């Protein structure tokens, strides 16, 4: 199977006067490349994909593909939907803008059954010939892709090579790799990056990496090189920021942190997303001070 | 405040050969009118709003508005989105198509904060001049509209007149009506229709009403007349069908039941929604036998 693994960043989408800041998006991705990141994830949840137009999502994918041209860094484009016909179209459009693969979230709100999840992802996998990484985050979607459904999709469709697990369920990650050790388990939960990698996970799709790409990159590569003492040391050190980056719902804290570090020019969200409370604002600012934040 | 209350039906959307069966859709709405239903809800979650096109969603609202002209039945159109710019647009389009009000689900998947939820609904309420009913279903959206957020929205915005509670939280229903008794609490959970109405709820937006509109109609109006002994008797008798209609995710059981009762001609869903398991198919068939199902 063709795979996209390693240290990956769920890119924020900076806004300036209500429009997508193309420069800063481009300058932010080059910062990730410069700090050891293996792949970038445009227009995901951390990129506020719910409030982007198809034209804005297509510009962000094109910016990601062009900024990582001539480098080993891949583009794992977010192309998911709770409607299978749309998810197929988003998959085809991401392949056409030059993405090396797609991260397609489980259908949200309409809560499909396991049978429906299988047919949903099977239709996506047979629509394109590029890798497809499953994304299971039940707290946001209301749905859970069972391990049996994940394993069946991995074995029955060739483009599906693994799953992004943001469920806070290390038991399920053992279940996945004990019954299907060839799949690519990817961490979607920054605080438990090392425990997932220590069980055989082959990468992370991080929110923290937006602010500290060098540390998340080093963590992933330490663990993949079986240097668990250094991977756990970085994981322990990132715990405070990994948690505080979820004081409010992602990407509200991480965008606030990028603004506080001067990495973006505006602290603008699109509704229903909003700036955090003064209380959480001070908490993010105070937690950032204990970390060395790389510039441009 | 202008309100839309009473027995209301979350309409299913019948499909035939992958297209919206417009004739059958109109004949299902007229069946609801003839059985005492006070309002119809097009393009809701039970209508598979996630997999409908905007042109298809506009056809369903127009069919509902046209079928309810010359009658007392109002059209509470589904017009929600996890993007406020879209939810505002859907609100404006539903009123322009003749809808008496809109049912606006809480933003799903992207999990806005309470502050974000307030601005989301405030932006929707100030966009149209028709009543707006909040919709809180945390199991599907991943977010919860707090009691304080609902009460603030009810008092600060005039189109907002209440909330459709699908929370399994009779404590919260006491919380809402004890601190703000002027709002219109609507039951979004069929099995607990009577307890919500008996505490001061003024209506239901029902899934069972698709199959048994006369019993949901009689239940609600018995309760509104404080004939609680008869309202509870219908609620107790409906408990078996109210639960079995959620053995799988709504609207999979209700569409299965409508097909089994011959009220819709084809049992078609749009992916990721699918036909139910053969076991649950038999269970739905077995529960229907003990109820008197009205025809056309
Ligand atoms: Mg359900």
From Swiss-Prot, chains A, B:
Pathway annotation: Amino-acid biosynthesis; L-lysine biosynthesis via DAP pathway; (S)-tetrahydrodipicolinate from L-aspartate: step 3/4
Subcellular compartments: Cytoplasm
Gene Ontology MF, one: 4-hydroxy-tetrahydrodipicolinate synthase activity
Swiss-Prot/TrEMBL keywords: Amino-acid biosynthesis, Cytoplasm, Diaminopimelate biosynthesis, Lyase, Lysine biosynthesis, Schiff base
GO cellular component: cytosol
Enzyme Commission designation: 4.3.3.7
Cross-referenced InterPro entries: Aldolase_TIM, DapA, DapA-like, Schiff_base-form_aldolases_AS, Schiff_base-form_aldolases_CS
Residues annotated as catalytic: 135, 164
Listed GO biological process terms: diaminopimelate biosynthetic process; lysine biosynthetic process via diaminopimelate
Catalytic activity: L-aspartate 4-semialdehyde + pyruvate = (2S,4S)-4-hydroxy-2,3,4,5-tetrahydrodipicolinate + H2O + H(+)
Residues reported to bind pyruvate: 46, 205
Annotated positions for site Part of a proton relay during catalysis: 45, 109
Pfam families: DHDPS
General function of this protein: Catalyzes the condensation of (S)-aspartate-beta-semialdehyde [(S)-ASA] and pyruvate to 4-hydroxy-tetrahydrodipicolinate (HTPA).
Family matches, as HAMAP family: DapA (MF_00418)
Similarity annotation: Belongs to the DapA family.
Quaternary state and interactors: Homotetramer; dimer of dimers.
Protein name in the entry: 4-hydroxy-tetrahydrodipicolinate synthase
Source organism (scientific name): Campylobacter jejuni subsp. jejuni serotype O:2 (strain ATCC 700819 / NCTC 11168)
Annotated gene: dapA
């Amino acid at each position: 199977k063709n795979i996209i693994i390693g240290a990956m960043t769920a890119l924020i989408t900076p806004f300036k006067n209500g429009k997508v800041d193309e420069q800063s998006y481009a300058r932010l991705i080059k910062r990730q490349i410069e700090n050891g990141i293996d792949a970038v994830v445009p227009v995901g949840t951390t990129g506020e994909s719910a409030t982007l137009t198809h034209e804005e999502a297509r510009t962000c994918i094109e910016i990601a593909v062009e900024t990582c041209k001539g480098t080993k860094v891949k583009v794992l484009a977010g192309a998911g939907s709770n409607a299978t016909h749309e998810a197929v179209g988003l998959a085809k459009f991401a392949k056409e803008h030059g993405a090396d693969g797609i991260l397609s979230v489980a259908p949200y709100y309409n809560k499909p059954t396991q049978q429906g999840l299988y047919e949903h992802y099977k239709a996506i996998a047979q629509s394109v010939d590029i890798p497809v990484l499953l994304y299971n985050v039940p707290g946001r979607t209301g749905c859970e892709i069972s391990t049996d459904t994940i394993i069946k999709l991995f074995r029955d469709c060739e483009n599906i090579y693994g799953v992004k697990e943001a469920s806070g369920n290390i038991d399920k990650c053992v279940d996945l790799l004990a019954h299907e050790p060839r799949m690519m388990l990817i961490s979607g939960e920054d605080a438990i990056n090392y425990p997932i990698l220590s069980n055989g996970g082959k990468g992370v799709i991080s929110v923290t990496s937006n602010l500290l790409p060098d540390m998340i990159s080093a963590l992933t590569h330490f663990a993949l090189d079986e240097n668990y003492k250094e991977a756990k040391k970085i994981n322990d050190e990132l715990y405070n920021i990994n948690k505080i980056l979820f004081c409010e719902s992602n990407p509200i804290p991480i965008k606030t942190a990028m603004y506080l570090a001067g990495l973006i020019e505006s602290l603008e969200f699109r509704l229903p997303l909003c700036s955090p409370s003064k209380e959480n604002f001070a908490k993010i600012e105070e937690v950032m001070k204990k970390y060395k934040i790389k510039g441009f």
